[PDB]
Amino acid sequence: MMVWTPVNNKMFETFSYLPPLTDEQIAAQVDYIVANGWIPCLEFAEADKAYVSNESAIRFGSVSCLYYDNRYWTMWKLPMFGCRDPMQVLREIVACTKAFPDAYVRLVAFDNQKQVQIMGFLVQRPKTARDFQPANKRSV
Amino acid sequence: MMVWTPVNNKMFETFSYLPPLTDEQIAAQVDYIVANGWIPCLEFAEADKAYVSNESAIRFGSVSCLYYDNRYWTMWKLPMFGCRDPMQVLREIVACTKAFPDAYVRLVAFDNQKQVQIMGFLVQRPKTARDFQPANKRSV
Amino acid sequence: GAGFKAGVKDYRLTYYTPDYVVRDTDILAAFRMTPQPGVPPEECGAAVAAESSTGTWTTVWTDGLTSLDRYKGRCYDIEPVPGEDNQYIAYVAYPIDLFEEGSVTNMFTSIVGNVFGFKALRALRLEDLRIPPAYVKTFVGPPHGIQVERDKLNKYGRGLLGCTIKPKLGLSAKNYGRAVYECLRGGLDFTKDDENVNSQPFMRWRDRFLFVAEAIYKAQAETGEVKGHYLNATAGTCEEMMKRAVCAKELGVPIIMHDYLTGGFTANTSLAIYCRDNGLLLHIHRAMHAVIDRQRNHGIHFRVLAKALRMSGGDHLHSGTAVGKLEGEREVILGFVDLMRDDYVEKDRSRGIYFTQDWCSMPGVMPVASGGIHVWHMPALVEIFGDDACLQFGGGTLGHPWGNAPGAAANRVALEACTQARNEGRDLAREGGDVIRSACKWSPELAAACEVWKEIKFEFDTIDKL
Amino acid sequence: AGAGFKAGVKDYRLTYYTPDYVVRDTDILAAFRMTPQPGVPPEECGAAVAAESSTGTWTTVWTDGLTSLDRYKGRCYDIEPVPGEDNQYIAYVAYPIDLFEEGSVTNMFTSIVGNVFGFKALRALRLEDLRIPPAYVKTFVGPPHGIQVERDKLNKYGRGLLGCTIKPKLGLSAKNYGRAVYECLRGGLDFTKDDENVNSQPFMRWRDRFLFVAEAIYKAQAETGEVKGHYLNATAGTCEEMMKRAVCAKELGVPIIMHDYLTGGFTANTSLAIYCRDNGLLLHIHRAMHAVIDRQRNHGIHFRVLAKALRMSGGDHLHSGTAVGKLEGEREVILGFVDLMRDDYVEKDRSRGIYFTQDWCSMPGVMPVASGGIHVWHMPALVEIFGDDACLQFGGGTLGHPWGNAPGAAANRVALEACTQARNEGRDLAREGGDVIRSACKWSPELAAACEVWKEIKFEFDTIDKL
Amino acid sequence: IVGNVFGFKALRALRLEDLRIPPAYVKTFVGPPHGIQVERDKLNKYGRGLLGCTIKPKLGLSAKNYGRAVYECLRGGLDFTKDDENVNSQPFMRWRDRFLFVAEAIYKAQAETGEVKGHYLNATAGTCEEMMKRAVCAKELGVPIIMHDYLTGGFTANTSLAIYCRDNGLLLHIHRAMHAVIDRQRNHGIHFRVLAKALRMSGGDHLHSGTAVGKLEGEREVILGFVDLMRDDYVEKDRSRGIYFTQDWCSMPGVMPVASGGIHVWHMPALVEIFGDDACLQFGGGTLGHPWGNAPGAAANRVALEACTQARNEGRDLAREGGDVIRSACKWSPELAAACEVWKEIKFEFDTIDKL
Amino acid sequence: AGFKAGVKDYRLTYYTPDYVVRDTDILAAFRMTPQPGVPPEECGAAVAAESSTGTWTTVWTDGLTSLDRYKGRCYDIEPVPGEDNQYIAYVAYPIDLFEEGSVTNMFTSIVGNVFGFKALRALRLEDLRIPPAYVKTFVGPPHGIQVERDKLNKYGRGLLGCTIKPKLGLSAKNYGRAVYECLRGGLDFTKDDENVNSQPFMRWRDRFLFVAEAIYKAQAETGEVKGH
Ligand SMILES: O=C(O)[C@@](O)(COP(=O)(O)O)[C@H](O)[C@H](O)COP(=O)(O)O
Ligand SMILES: O=C(O)[C@@](O)(COP(=O)(O)O)[C@H](O)[C@H](O)COP(=O)(O)O
Ligand SMILES: O=C(O)[C@@](O)(COP(=O)(O)O)[C@H](O)[C@H](O)COP(=O)(O)O
Ligand SMILES: [Mg+2]
Ligand SMILES: [Mg+2]
Numbered sequence A, B: 001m002m003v004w005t006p007v008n009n010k011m012f013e014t015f016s017y018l019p020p021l022t023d024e025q026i027a028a029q030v031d032y033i034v035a036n037g038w039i040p041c042l043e044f045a046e047a048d049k050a051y052v053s054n055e056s057a058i059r060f061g062s063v064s065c066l067y068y069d070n071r072y073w074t075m076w077k078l079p080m081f082g083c084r085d086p087m088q089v090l091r092e093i094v095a096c097t098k099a100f101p102d103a104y105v106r107l108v109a110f111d112n113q114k115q116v117q118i119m120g121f122l123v124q125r126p127k128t129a130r131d132f133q134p135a136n137k138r139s140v
Numbered sequence C: 001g002a003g004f005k006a007g008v009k010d011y012r013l014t015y016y017t018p019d020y021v022v023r024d025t026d027i028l029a030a031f032r033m034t035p036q037p038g039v040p041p042e043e044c045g046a047a048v049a050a051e052s053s054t055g056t057w058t059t060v061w062t063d064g065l066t067s068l069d070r071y072k073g074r075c076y077d078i079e080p081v082p083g084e085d086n087q088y089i090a091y092v093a094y095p096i097d098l099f100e101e102g103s104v105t106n107m108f109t110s111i112v113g114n115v116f117g118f119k120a121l122r123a124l125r126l127e128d129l130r131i132p133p134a135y136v137k138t139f140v141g142p143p144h145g146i147q148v149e150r151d152k153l154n155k156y157g158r159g160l161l162g163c164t165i166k167p168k169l170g171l172s173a174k175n176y177g178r179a180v181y182e183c184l185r186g187g188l189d190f191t192k193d194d195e196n197v198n199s200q201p202f203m204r205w206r207d208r209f210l211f212v213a214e215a216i217y218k219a220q221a222e223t224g225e226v227k228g229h230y231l232n233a234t235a236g237t238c239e240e241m242m243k244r245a246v247c248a249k250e251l252g253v254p255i256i257m258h259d260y261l262t263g264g265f266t267a268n269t270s271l272a273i274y275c276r277d278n279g280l281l282l283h284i285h286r287a288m289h290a291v292i293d294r295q296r297n298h299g300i301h302f303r304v305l306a307k308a309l310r311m312s313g314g315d316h317l318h319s320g321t322a323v324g325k326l327e328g329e330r331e332v333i334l335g336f337v338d339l340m341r342d343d344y345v346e347k348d349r350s351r352g353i354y355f356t357q358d359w360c361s362m363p364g365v366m367p368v369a370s371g372g373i374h375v376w377h378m379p380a381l382v383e384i385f386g387d388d389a390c391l392q393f394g395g396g397t398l399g400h401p402w403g404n405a406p407g408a409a410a411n412r413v414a415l416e417a418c419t420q421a422r423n424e425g426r427d428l429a430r431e432g433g434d435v436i437r438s439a440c441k442w443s444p445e446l447a448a449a450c451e452v453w454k455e456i457k458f459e460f461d462t463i464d465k466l
Numbered sequence D: 001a002g003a004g005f006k007a008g009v010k011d012y013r014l015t016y017y018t019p020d021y022v023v024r025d026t027d028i029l030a031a032f033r034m035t036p037q038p039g040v041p042p043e044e045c046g047a048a049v050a051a052e053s054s055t056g057t058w059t060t061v062w063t064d065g066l067t068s069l070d071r072y073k074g075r076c077y078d079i080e081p082v083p084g085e086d087n088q089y090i091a092y093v094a095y096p097i098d099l100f101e102e103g104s105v106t107n108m109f110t111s112i113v114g115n116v117f118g119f120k121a122l123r124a125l126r127l128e129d130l131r132i133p134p135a136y137v138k139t140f141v142g143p144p145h146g147i148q149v150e151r152d153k154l155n156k157y158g159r160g161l162l163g164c165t166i167k168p169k170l171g172l173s174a175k176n177y178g179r180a181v182y183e184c185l186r187g188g189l190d191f192t193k194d195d196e197n198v199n200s201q202p203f204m205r206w207r208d209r210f211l212f213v214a215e216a217i218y219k220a221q222a223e224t225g226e227v228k229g230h231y232l233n234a235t236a237g238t239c240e241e242m243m244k245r246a247v248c249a250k251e252l253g254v255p256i257i258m259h260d261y262l263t264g265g266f267t268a269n270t271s272l273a274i275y276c277r278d279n280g281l282l283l284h285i286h287r288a289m290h291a292v293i294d295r296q297r298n299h300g301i302h303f304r305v306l307a308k309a310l311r312m313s314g315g316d317h318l319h320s321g322t323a324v325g326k327l328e329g330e331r332e333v334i335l336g337f338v339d340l341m342r343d344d345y346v347e348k349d350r351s352r353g354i355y356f357t358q359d360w361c362s363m364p365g366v367m368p369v370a371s372g373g374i375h376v377w378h379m380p381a382l383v384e385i386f387g388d389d390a391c392l393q394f395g396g397g398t399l400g401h402p403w404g405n406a407p408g409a410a411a412n413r414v415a416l417e418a419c420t421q422a423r424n425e426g427r428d429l430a431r432e433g434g435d436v437i438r439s440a441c442k443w444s445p446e447l448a449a450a451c452e453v454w455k456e457i458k459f460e461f462d463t464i465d466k467l
Numbered sequence E: 001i002v003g004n005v006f007g008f009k010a011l012r013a014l015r016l017e018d019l020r021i022p023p024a025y026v027k028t029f030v031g032p033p034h035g036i037q038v039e040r041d042k043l044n045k046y047g048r049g050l051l052g053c054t055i056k057p058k059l060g061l062s063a064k065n066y067g068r069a070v071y072e073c074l075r076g077g078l079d080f081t082k083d084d085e086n087v088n089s090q091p092f093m094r095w096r097d098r099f100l101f102v103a104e105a106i107y108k109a110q111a112e113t114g115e116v117k118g119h120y121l122n123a124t125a126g127t128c129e130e131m132m133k134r135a136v137c138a139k140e141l142g143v144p145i146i147m148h149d150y151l152t153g154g155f156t157a158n159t160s161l162a163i164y165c166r167d168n169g170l171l172l173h174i175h176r177a178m179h180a181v182i183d184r185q186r187n188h189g190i191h192f193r194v195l196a197k198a199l200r201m202s203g204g205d206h207l208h209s210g211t212a213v214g215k216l217e218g219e220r221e222v223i224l225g226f227v228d229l230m231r232d233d234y235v236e237k238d239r240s241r242g243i244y245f246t247q248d249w250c251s252m253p254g255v256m257p258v259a260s261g262g263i264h265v266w267h268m269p270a271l272v273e274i275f276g277d278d279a280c281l282q283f284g285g286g287t288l289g290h291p292w293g294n295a296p297g298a299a300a301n302r303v304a305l306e307a308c309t310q311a312r313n314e315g316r317d318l319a320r321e322g323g324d325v326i327r328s329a330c331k332w333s334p335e336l337a338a339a340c341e342v343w344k345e346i347k348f349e350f351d352t353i354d355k356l
Numbered sequence F: 001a002g003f004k005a006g007v008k009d010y011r012l013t014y015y016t017p018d019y020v021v022r023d024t025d026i027l028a029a030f031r032m033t034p035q036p037g038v039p040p041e042e043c044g045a046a047v048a049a050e051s052s053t054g055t056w057t058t059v060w061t062d063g064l065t066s067l068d069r070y071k072g073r074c075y076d077i078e079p080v081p082g083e084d085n086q087y088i089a090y091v092a093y094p095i096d097l098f099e100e101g102s103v104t105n106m107f108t109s110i111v112g113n114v115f116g117f118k119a120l121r122a123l124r125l126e127d128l129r130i131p132p133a134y135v136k137t138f139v140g141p142p143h144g145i146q147v148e149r150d151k152l153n154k155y156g157r158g159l160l161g162c163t164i165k166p167k168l169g170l171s172a173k174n175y176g177r178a179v180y181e182c183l184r185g186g187l188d189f190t191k192d193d194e195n196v197n198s199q200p201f202m203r204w205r206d207r208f209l210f211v212a213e214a215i216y217k218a219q220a221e222t223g224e225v226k227g228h
């Protein structure tokens, strides 16, 4: 029996239980966005604004149900409307992570028919983050 | 497309989106107070009391609408009632910043007919402040 | 014109109207009908139309005070059923005027109230209903729906993962919260009360709600992901049901559940309205449905019960698994999953969709695949449902040899590996086993789960055939 | 080492088939007519049903060890073959009282009938009967009033009560509704009623109806000198709308409301029954949708279980069937659950489908209501089947009378009183019933007119729900 | 006053130009929940016009996308954003979902900028009961400001809401939707100045006043007349601005004029010159139409506002040097420069219908 | 199609002369008077745009959603006979644009801002097509004609009413005196003048009370149901 560690084992929603994505794996996900005609977009946040929190609820009556701070991140430029070039998305990842090397950065895509984010995953975490485990240190 | 930075880009209400005011620009603003017969006043706060916060709302029922801590700052002496000399205002700026070199200091003016503060801007921030950007670093 | 004439006449004289052109505001019903010997299909269809709308067994004078043409239900078409000597699909049209606005209860009371018990028929099954936009618009509908739910949870790009705590009954409130915490922290988005977990001597509801809240918040802080547990508001009275929903609201937790058929449509609609007004997600359990919907010859098909739930209100509804311990064929499930999720679903008899259904922007309901499923089913589940579903592993989590957190991790790893493979262009029907086996190489949790349930399948002759 | 956690699938029968179990007097018992898939032993199928309606799932869970499964598990403790059936068995399951929420029919159903009917490993499943122990019965408020209190409140004794559904089902205006109700009540009927599907609709809004019906009720009562009522329908889309309608009836001072308990649901029904108890309204229960569940022999839930559940949830009247009318239900089957609805104690009697002795521990009885396709010639049979403690309803049988509602009411009332009198005098209604009716026709033109119109009218078909 | 007389056969046209509301009647009204001075004091905002922005497209956005747009707008230097007048509760976005996401956005932008932020959450509804439900939610979220369409919801509902806002500390933004049905034509109807006096009495903290230079009609001199009637305690008769009567408000609080509709960065100098500091200036398309997105759009408008305010304070003539002040600010502000380039040629100049 | 910042003609998105109206669409007939130099098509499109989804410049946020699904559509323009510069513009609004059961919201979209646009000289809404699927969202009248006749027990002739005069200035007791005298002579109803609410000369609750007395007196005297 291996034991799933509760210590410094923060996750990041979709694909965070898989081994870290290679550049080829990221490119494959970008090709999937393009193949489906979805709208690519990058979002970023400093480390303090990265995970869901409750601080604004100090101002509330009994209305905190499904309210969390830090769900919204900051938009890198605009969603890439009309983008049909995966290399364009990859170049924006490079540009975003260069401008904000110490931020968390995620790639998302929007479907305008459902009007919902249709995919998303973390593409950068700051090098100073110590709150996560290698795939093989998730259980001890 | 340049991206407005969410990181360490705190503002300070009126004039904080312009380049930092020169001494000549501050003097022009003081002349404007005097020309209009308004009452000059200085206010100051230590760094922890500078920005609006919510801590007192822990004591509240559902009455936090338009309540914030740190709107009030500390009055430097008294409002300069009957002041018609801009040099007098500039001397109090020097006096206030010398007594509190590590405080935020703002210059305000009151109109007693409307009974409202009629102007205001930051004249000093502590040298240790790291939560603001120079004008050319606000976007990336 | 025409005097009142006392006495019995054939229903078909008034209620069989084969040349009637249906109106776009009519509610339409497709009845699989088995007449008694000696009862013509036309008279049997007319009897069903009559006794679910305006008519009784003998002529009444009071018809003359009103306009029967305006109000009567109309059997307007009868199809023979291929392969059946004594089965017919009778199509009935009901004027919109017959129905109370916003009341699924009233719609069922007319359409399925008395007609199934008539001596003159041997069996009757309601297969489908065409709910027109003008009637759909009278309903509040789901508290939130799929898009709003994902937005509130901040969860995108994969199926959601859930889990029913086991044993069904017998756990204390504290042990319940202990199990919930261990499940959620390993990678599941949700856990849930079993359908029959309400308030009982071994575990009172408010004790459970409190310990579960502690568990939710511990797992959320630990993982950095939004967590929830469907707290059961199902109760003996509307007043008890509401008390439970209020407590969930006051704890700030995301989601409650209701057993809509055993609690009932009246209580369910009330609860869905409460959830809308207070921002709670509402998970719907379909306990008792198979009493009604299992047999081909008699009852009400689940697709009708699913449409009724969408109207009454629910953010999630159980849909079946195809591959698990409970019955429901893939093609049948795909039909009503479209009816649950989509805005517009074209008639498609090969999936049992008898009518084109326009939902006129009523939010979609998240299908929940649950019951006897495990890690090896993951590729098939992802292929069937796509991302907009919740997949639930009760035994498939709490039956893991290393406990709940490793169990949750195994299911989460399997889901994400399948999703990734799907996104990369892989064929999950063919390559699913390979995707799972590849993931086992870097995931000891998954490998342990795969080993335990490798031989486990549920394959039986299907009762509810199209 | 002791018994530990072993991950994996094992047969349900290892835990949930306990053929030597001695049932406790607090256990809830279920009789399931079960049709296993080929290759599934009856023991494993009975055990799967017991497991998945109580404590177990498809694979072994470690959490069982934190609790005591022996204390909480459902137990298949007996399996009978069904005579005449190659692949049908009656599986008997015992549920500890600890499994159930007090006072909640909803929760009892959720366990016993929640998931098991959809299991791939069975082809069909029908819940035939339930043994509700006194210790569980006592947790329920029960019917708002019951038969004795109802008769006392109405001041009605010595005969069946007579009722009538207003027709057409839908399409009448509020004023025309109250007009028909007035004419029905004044001719001798004790009650009229909203059709089950009459709630609130574009052709007639509920509160307009309630008011005109109140006027009609009070007019007929003043005119006849007998207490009158009309079951006003509180069935609604939400609990709040249901309650508003009950409140309006309370504020009008009228005797009785109705609820469709299966389409409204048990949760709302129990609430309404409690409201009726607290405000002194009679509660008529309509069983709309039951035959979706209860018609077929091989699958569903027999009506007798649905009737027991209604008694527990709360209702002063419940529809029982007629035997002779337009809707199915055999005389012997009906007599079984009529005893279950009315009586305090009912012994096991498989010849009437009573699988368990039932002790109601003083919970009031529910008035059976015979309704649907009945007329004056059915009266002797109806009085013979039910006795005085029933309500007999003639909708078409009143509003289909050639002379109108008041003559139609009077004919039904004359027919009831003539048959009751003959019964009291020692006459055999099964043999002399036609003579009783023809004798009454001689002094009653209203009855004569009704007899002439419906003389040839019978409803005789092959019964689907055979024992 | 306007109940039956406009329909009389014996007249061809009737227009109510002005009303003299006497102090003795003014004193019977609760009036604005807060007014200009109290609003500035609660927001801690002094020395410049306030800046707002209507989210676009008008309809069709989801609750989450609404909050996303709001956060991006507020974080770039706008004080407020708002629901469009017709954003109430619809199938594409239910109100309570919006309120919650918008609260998140408000609190994110406020923590990010260090300035108090708000978004006018629309309480306009089909019934008073729904209207109040929405106000209550705003109160329980602790947010500063809600809005009401006072003509389409109506005076009875509006007065009730203004009283609620007074009792619960909520700022109340008033949208004048439907006014032009009534106030556009010179020969018939009711002049807006009367509709503005009525709003002041009924209760509102903000009221749309027109722009003079934007896409909707209202001449500078006409606007200046009723802006005085909205803000000031005492306004002398002045027929050259359409003021038929001397109006004494007997200390009833002033209403903040809101200039909105078809305005952009190049209009800034004229807007500041017309209104002075006590106004809210709103840029919907003028923010969400910026080539670089909402935050750069917000920053451009904020920079333009502050640059004009600073030039004004220094003694510069905005009426006459407005372009130079804007062009100077473009040299250190790429955001402003991008906005100036896109909207350089854009003007709204048509013959005025509502002439004095 | 990406985001292009800047102003373009409304007619490029909002004039759709080949649109087939849906049976759930709200339809509006606008009598429109454009300013000189504004084509009827651009004027109709501006009305359609600014009463539904559009503003004066292109917004990037359109791409997050489906403008085709939500936009108001000027689908037809008729010249007005006898008029050189008047047109009937026909606009179609998707049912999704409207709050269920809210006349307030329907008016706010359709007549909210467009009447004040500089680019038009005049605008009149002539008619609206309220589709069944929208009508059904409204509770509607408390009773309606049939139910009113039934509650009053009045059939076979017009009902007769009467506003008490002088409009203002009568005391509560005089009001009830006048009401009684009117009702007892054969009128079915009397009424408060529209501007009679509650005033120094007559407070509402005093009037309600005296009027009740009058209603019941006249009803007892005549044997006919009376109201005020
Ligand atoms: O009670 C149960 O069996 C479950 O908790 C699943 O447990 P496991 O995960 O341990 O199998 C669910 O309620 C069923 O899936 C309901 O069936 P359906 O979804 O068909 O309505
Ligand atoms: O709708 C009807 O058909 C009835 O009103 C009877 O009408 P008639 O009197 O005109 O036949 C009753 O609701 C049925 O008896 C219900 O059946 P059951 O009692 O079997 O539940
Ligand atoms: O709907 C609109 O057009 C606005 O949101 C502005 O949009 P833009 O900022 O994109 O122009 C405002 O409601 C109008 O200004 C109202 O007009 P007024 O102030 O005259 O009442
Ligand atoms: Mg379960
Ligand atoms: Mg009936």
Ligand SMILES: [Mg+2]
Pocket (backbone or CB within 6 Å): E054, E083, E084, E085, E086
């Ligand atoms: Mg607007």
Ligand SMILES: [Mg+2]
Pocket (backbone or CB within 6 Å): F163, F192, F193, F194, F195
């Ligand atoms: Mg009048």
